[PDB]
Amino acid sequence: QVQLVQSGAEVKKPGSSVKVSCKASGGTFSSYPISWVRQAPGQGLEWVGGIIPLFGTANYAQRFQGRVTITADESTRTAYMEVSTLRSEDTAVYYCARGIASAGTPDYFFYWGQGTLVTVSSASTKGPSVFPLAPSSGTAALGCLVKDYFPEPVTVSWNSGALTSGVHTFPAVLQSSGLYSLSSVVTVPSSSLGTQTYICNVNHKPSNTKVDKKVEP
Amino acid sequence: GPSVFLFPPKPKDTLMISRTPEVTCVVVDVSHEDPEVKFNWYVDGVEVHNAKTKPREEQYNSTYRVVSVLTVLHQDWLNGKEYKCKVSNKALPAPIEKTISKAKGQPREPQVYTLPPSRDELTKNQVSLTCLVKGFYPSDIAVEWESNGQPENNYKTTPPVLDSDGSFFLYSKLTVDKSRWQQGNVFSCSVMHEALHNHYTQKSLSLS
Amino acid sequence: EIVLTQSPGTLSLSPGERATLSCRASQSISSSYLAWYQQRPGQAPRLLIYGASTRATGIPDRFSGSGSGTDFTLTISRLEPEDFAVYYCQQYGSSPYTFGQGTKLEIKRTVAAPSVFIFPPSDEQLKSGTASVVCLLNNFYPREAKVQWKVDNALQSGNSQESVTEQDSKDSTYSLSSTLTLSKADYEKHKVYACEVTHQGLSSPVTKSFNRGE
Ligand SMILES: *[C@@H]1O[C@H](CO[C@@H]2O[C@@H](C)[C@@H](O)[C@@H](O)[C@@H]2O)[C@@H](O[C@@H]2O[C@H](CO)[C@@H](O[C@@H]3O[C@H](CO[C@H]4O[C@H](CO)[C@@H](O)[C@H](O)[C@@H]4O[C@@H]4O[C@H](CO)[C@@H](O)[C@H](O)[C@H]4NC(C)=O)[C@@H](O)[C@H](O[C@H]4O[C@H](CO)[C@@H](O)[C@H](O)[C@@H]4O[C@@H]4O[C@H](CO)[C@@H](O)[C@H](O)[C@H]4NC(C)=O)[C@@H]3O)[C@H](O)[C@H]2NC(C)=O)[C@H](O)[C@H]1NC(C)=O
């Protein structure tokens, strides 16, 4: 088998540029065409372009021509996709893919990288705000409002790690304008609210924000 | 004296890595008295020694014909490296040197257009399916016909014709029984050119 | 370019039933270059079938593909629980390579009404000038539901954002979060904040409300 490992998540302002790598390990590199496929959040798959490393001649879908440059370094077995003049409509996951047959024969996408989320966002690495969702009345509900944070994503635990039964961390919403809001809730027995202490552990890596807000009636 | 002609590899062979491209050095008008011929191959300047020489083929004009084949690397040909063949025979005033390489010029992607048969041709028992390939450069290109993975072989393709804008075009004609066409069968025109992604593309043609 | 159209958008079947997924091409194409892929959330597509009908190595025999011309079909004879994802068809005979919109397979279960909870804003948030009222719909099926916000018994518009969780791998239900974002000024101008939920598993709509500061 072949192993396709891409670079990490990228956050860019509009107009700037990004360059995603894709190192191939295991099999022979030069003879097999590497393609780039992108997927906007919640949407389907779109082929961006491709290149045969041995020949160094990239090709692109018409909509990306003049904006994307795809290259391949044979000495390090690494394919690159560079997108200049980023637009917000370029916010997508990007996959590199191959490819069982050598160049010249029509082939499918058998090997895939893990994907690279590219966010085109104007906000700044803003820490989250943690607001409680207090219970108010058999079964009680409480939670945590993680509002106006940046960027994706955050971790939400409950009591360090002792609470998982009934946790619902919802997917974040992109507010107008430019901020990610998210709720994380728990259903617990009402006949136990005045006994165990419920603590919501929100953690934000791109700002080092370890918040532990207690949620009490 | 003997003449020398140097031929490029077949376009399919340079575009497909599973195939072996080769440049061919043909020597014609070799006399019966002096048949021995020596070959010297030079890639971009440096001499190579991996070329093979096929046995002499006696021709029907009282002369022999010697062929030497040098397998080339797909990238080297496409990147414009030059291949030189020096022919030395004990009857030439001086050894003859011939050289070929790729055409030089910005490559252009081939546009592929399948054309159904004219309604006036449905009177016949066989029908002509047309594949127009225009706007490509250089002229090195390969065209084939298939039908759901199976090769259609009763086809002819015109040689490349230089167009008014510097690019090239050609036509390929596939002949099928009219019943197969009326039955709604799907035929495909497979085109191979260096300016295509993965050197490949194909268009389908069907009655509707 | 070639346009692949997949039907339907969502397919709701139970584990063990048969599944059929269609992929209509805008024009006739060679069946030798039609592929089917599967994609789970947060993962890259996995190749299921290529050549319209040939099964990839290490793919269970319950996956089969067929079709030609403009009509291609992926059938799963007997659905396993890990078969509930989204499926893509893709042609690769001519550049650009194109994918259909995708079809999502979800688990069909019995109807489950939601538990409805409403959360008033927290005092620490009202210092910033914004008030968020959150309404939780918990563990319900099917996914389709109507969540309307009422402020002083007046229907709201343009100030609510929803969010649906993924189908729970344990009980096959969904949960929905709806957030009503107002300003501190507007929030203090009214008293009654209600969340009214309409769902199939509910005879009459359920309402959860509170009074500002009470
Ligand atoms: C004695 O016989 C031999 C063998 O011929 C055979 O036997 C006799 C008895 C008869 O039965 C023949 O019918 C039979 O074929 C004769 O040897 C022949 O000699 C002539 C020249 O006198 C050569 O002509 C040249 O042909 C090339 C193209 O040749 C390909 O296509 C031929 C069919 O059209 C085919 O027969 C060839 O074998 C060859 O085929 C290719 O082969 C390779 C390798 O095997 C293969 O990979 C290819 O796929 C294959 N291609 C096919 C099959 O299509 C042609 O290009 C030459 O033209 C150039 O030179 C001319 C001047 O000589 C000039 O007028 C042209 O315009 C052209 O000039 C060039 O133009 C370009 C751009 O236009 C420019 O960039 C160049 O600079 C320019 N070059 C110049 C000016 O020099 C040429 O016409 C035959 O190939 C050759 N036959 C064989 C089999 O080798 C011998 O002549 C006889 N002796 C006599 C009669 O006294």
Domains, chain C? 1-109 (2.60.40.10), 110-212 (2.60.40.10)
Beta bridge mates, C209: C194
Å from CA of B83 to ligand 1 middle: 19
Give C5's contacts (C-beta < 8 A, 6+ positions apart).
C23, C24, C25, C26, C100, C101
- By CB atoms closer than 10 A (0-12, 13-18, 19+), residue A194 is exposed
Q: What is the distance between the alpha carbons of residues C214 and C153, in angstroms, rounded to a whole number?
A: 17
Instruction: Give 3-state DSSP helix, strand, coil % of chain C, rounded to 5.
Output: 5, 55, 40
Q: How many CA atoms lie within 13 A of A50 on its CB side?
A: 27
Q: How far apart are the CA of B26 and the centre of ligand 1, in A?
A: 9
**B120 to chain A nearest CA, in Å?**
36
Verify cis geometry, omega within 30 degrees of 0, for the bond prior to B11.
no
Query: H-helix or E-strand containing C188?
Result: helix C184-189
Judge whether A81 and A61 are in contact, CB under 8 Å: no
Q: Looking at ligand 1, which residue's alpha carbon is closest to its atom 80?
A: B5
Encoded amino acid at C74, one letter: L
Interfacial C residues in 91-130 facing B (CB < 8 Å): 93-95
Method: X-ray
> 3-class DSSP state for residue A164?
coil
Of A106, C31, C101, C4, nearest to B206 by C-alpha is C31
Cα of B32 from ligand 1 centre, angstroms: 20
Ligand 1: centre distance to CA B87 (Å): 17
How many of the other CB atoms lie within 10 Å of CB of A147?
22
Strands A10-12 and A116-120, bridge-based pairing: parallel
Q: Which of B57, B61, B69, B101 most suits a substitution to test ligand 1, by most atoms within 8 Å of the C-beta?
A: B61
Residue A193 phi/psi, 5-degree rounding, is -65, -40
Amino acid identity of C181?
T
**Residue pair C138/A168 in contact by the 8 Å Cβ criterion:** yes
Nearest CA in chain A to B77: A55
Q: List CB contacts (< 8 A) between B110 and chain C.
A: none
* Cβ atoms < 10 Å from Cβ of C130: 17
3-state secondary structure A110-136: CEECCCEEEEECCCCCCCCEEEEECCC
Report which protein residue has its CA nearest ligand 1's atom 38. B26
Q: Choose the mutation target among C1, C4, C24, C28 for the interface with B, i.e. most B CBs under 10 Å.
A: C28
Please identify, by atom number, the ligand 1 atom nearest to the C-alpha of residue B60. Answer: 9
**Tally of CB atoms within 10 A around A88:** 11
φ/ψ (deg, to 5) at A192: -170, 0
| A213, A134 Cβ separation under 8 angstroms | no
Max alpha carbon distance in chain C (Å)? 69
| Per-position DSSP letters for A27-86, written without gaps between them | S--TTS-EEEEEE-TTS-EEEEEEE-TTT---EE-GGGTTTEEEEEETTTTEEEEEE-S-
Q: Evaluate whether C6 touches C101 at the Cβ level (below 8 Å).
A: yes
Cross-chain Cβ contact B206/C69 below 8 Å: yes
How many angstroms separate the CA atoms of B15 and B21, rounded? 9
Atom of ligand 1 nearest to the CA of B28: 17
Residue C120 and residue C211 in contact, taking contact as beta carbons nearer than 8 Å: no
Q: A111-112 and A92-98: which strand pairing? A: antiparallel
| Dihedrals phi, psi of B90, to nearest 5 degrees | -75, 35
Q: Which residue of A has its CA nearest to B198?
A: A104
- Concatenate the DSSP letters of all residues of C123-187 into one string: HHHHTTTEEEEEEEEEEEBSS--EEEEEETTEE--SSEEEEEPPPPTTT--EEEEEEEEEEHHHH
Sorted by sequence, the CB contacts under 8 Å of residue B47 that are 6+ apart come out as B40, B41
Q: Are B165 and B172 in contact (CB under 8 A)?
A: no
The fold for domain A123-217 equals Immunoglobulin-like (2.60.40)
Query: Which residues on chain A are in Cβ contact (under 8 Å) with B15?
Result: 103-104
* Separation of alpha carbons A84 and A17, rounded Å: 4
Q: Which residues contact B173 (CB under 8 A, 6 or more apart)?
A: B128, B129, B130, B131, B155, B156, B157
Subunit partners of chain C (3 or more CB pairs within 8 A) = A, B
Q: Which two tokens stand for residue B88?
A: 């030395």
Where do the domains of chain B lie, and which CATH numbers do they carry? 2-101 (no CATH), 102-208 (2.60.40.10)
Specify the 3-state DSSP secondary structure of A191: coil
CA distance A47 to C98: 7
Write phi, then psi, for C165 (nearest 5 degrees): -75, 165
Whether C196 contacts C133, CB under 8 Å: no
Contact A70, A83 (CB under 8 A): no
What angle is formed at CA C59 by the lines to CA C7 and CA C72, rounded to 5 degrees? 30
CA nearest A61: which of B102, C98, C184? C98
Distance between CA B133 and CA B154 in Å, rounded?
A: 18
Q: Would you call B188 and C69 a contact, using CB atoms and an 8 Å cutoff? A: no
Which token pair is A187? 């259903």
3-state class (DSSP) for residue B67: strand
What is the best residue among B7, B60, B141 to mutate for testing ligand 1's pocket, by most ligand atoms within 8 Å of CB? Answer: B7
- Residues in C touching A183 (Cβ below 8 Å): 134, 136, 163, 177, 179
CB B21 within 8 A of CB B74: yes
Residue A136 sits at the chain C interface (C-beta within 8 Å): yes
CA distance to partner chain C, nearest, from residue A61 (Å): 6
Centre of ligand 1 from the C-alpha of residue B28, in Å:
9
User: Which chain A residues are within 8 Å of B19, Cβ to Cβ?
Assistant: 104
Tell me the CA–centroid distance for residue B24 and ligand 1, in Å. 12
Which is it for the CA torsion C56, C57, C63, C65, positive or negative? Answer: positive
B109: closest chain C residue by CA: C95
Rounded CA separation B11/B110 (Å): 14
CB B98 within 8 A of CB B7: no
Structure tokens at B131: 């594949």
Round to whole Å and give the CA distance between B69 and B54: 8
Nearest chain A Cα distance for residue B18, angstroms:
7
Query: Please, are residues A56 and A67 in contact by the beta-carbon 8 Å criterion?
Result: no
Q: Resolution in angstroms for this experimental structure?
A: 2.8
Q: With an 8 Å Cβ cutoff, are B204 and C27 in contact?
A: yes
Which residues in chain A are contacts of C164 at CB distance < 8 A? 170-171
* Closest among B42, B39, B24 to B96, alpha carbons compared: B39
The C-alpha atoms of residue B153 and residue A89 are separated, in whole angstroms, by 46
Euclidean distance between CA atoms C137 and B132, whole angstroms: 60
Of A119, A126, A132, A121, the closest CA to residue A183 belongs to A132
Does residue A55 contact residue A103 with C-beta atoms inside 8 Å? yes
In angstroms, the CA B136 to CA C95 distance is 15
Cα of first residue to Cα of last residue in chain C, in angstroms, is 62
- Of B17, B78, B197, nearest to A31 by CB-CB distance is B17
The backbone torsions φ and ψ at residue C134, rounded to the nearest 5 degrees and listed phi first, read -105, 135
Instruction: Give the integer Cα–Cα distance in Å for A145 and A134.
Output: 10
Q: Are A213 and A144 in contact (CB under 8 A)?
A: yes
To test the contact with chain B by mutation, choose from C4, C27, C29, C30 the residue with the greatest count of B C-beta atoms within 10 A, namely C30
Q: Report strand pairing: C10-13 vs B161-162.
A: unpaired
Contact yes or no for C116/C135 (Cβ under 8 A): yes
Task: Look at C90 and A108 and tell me if their CB atoms are within 8 Å.
Answer: yes
Q: How far apart are CA A111 and CA C34, in angstroms?
A: 17
CA-nearest of B126, B158, B127 to B143 is B158
Residues at CB less than 6 angstroms from ligand 1: B 3, 5, 7, 24, 26, 28-29, 59-61, 63, 65
Cis peptide before B138 (omega within 30 of 0): yes
Number of helices (H), then strands (E), in chain B: 3, 17
Tell me the residue type at B71. Answer: T
* Two structure tokens written together for C172: 């096959």
Side-chain-facing half-sphere of A51: CA atoms under 13 Å: 23
Distance CA A171, CA A160 (A): 21
Asked whether A145 and A135 are in contact (CB, 8 A), the reply is no
Residues B63 and B29: beta-carbon distance below 8 Å: yes
What would the two tokens of residue B56 be? Answer: 């002499």
Under DSSP, is residue A179 helix (H, G, I), strand (E, B) or coil?
A: strand
Question: Of A113, A112, A120, whose CA–CA distance to A67 is shortest?
Answer: A120
Instruction: Give dist(CA C27, CA B206) in Å, integer.
Output: 9
Q: Name the residue among C11, C90, C10 with its Cα closest to residue C46.
A: C90
DSSP state of A104: T
Sign of CA dihedral C105, C109, C114, C115: negative
A3 interfaces chain C, CB cutoff of 8 Å = no
Adjacent-strand bridge partners of C99: C90
CB-based contacts of C117: which residues, under 8 Å, 6+ apart?
A141, A185, C135, C136, C138, C208
Beta strands in B44-186 (DSSP E): 46-48, 52-54, 64-71, 83-89, 96-100, 111-115, 126-136, 142-147, 150-152, 155-157, 161-162, 168-177
Q: Domain boundaries in chain A?
A: 1-122, 123-217
Residue C18 burial by Cβ neighbours in a 10 Å radius (0-12, 13-18, 19+): exposed
Task: Give, in order, the Cα–Cα distances in Å from C134 to each of A212, B67, C118, C122, C210.
Answer: 20, 84, 6, 11, 12
Return the closest-CA partner of residue C118 out of C141, C102, C143, C136: C136
Residue with tokens 């560079």: A82
Are the Cβ atoms of C132 and A147 closer than 8 angstroms?
A: yes
Residue C47: closest CA among C3, C89, C94? C89
Identify the bridge partners of residue A138 per DSSP, sorted by sequence position: none
- Phi, psi angle pair for B7, to nearest 5°: -115, 145
Q: Give the ranges where chain B is alpha helix by DSSP (H).
A: 11-15, 74-78, 178-182
Residue C148 C-alpha, separation from nearest chain A C-alpha, in angstroms: 18
Q: How far is Cα C49 from Cα B86, in angstroms, rounded to an integer? A: 52
* Structure letter (DSSP) for residue B86: E
Residue B52, burial from CB neighbour count under 10 angstroms (0-12, 13-18, 19+): exposed
Question: Whole-angstrom Cα distance, residue C180 to residue C134?
Answer: 6
Mutate to test the pocket of ligand 1, among B32, B59, B72 (most ligand atoms within 8 A of CB): B59
The answer to whether A91 and A38 are in contact (CB under 8 A) is: no
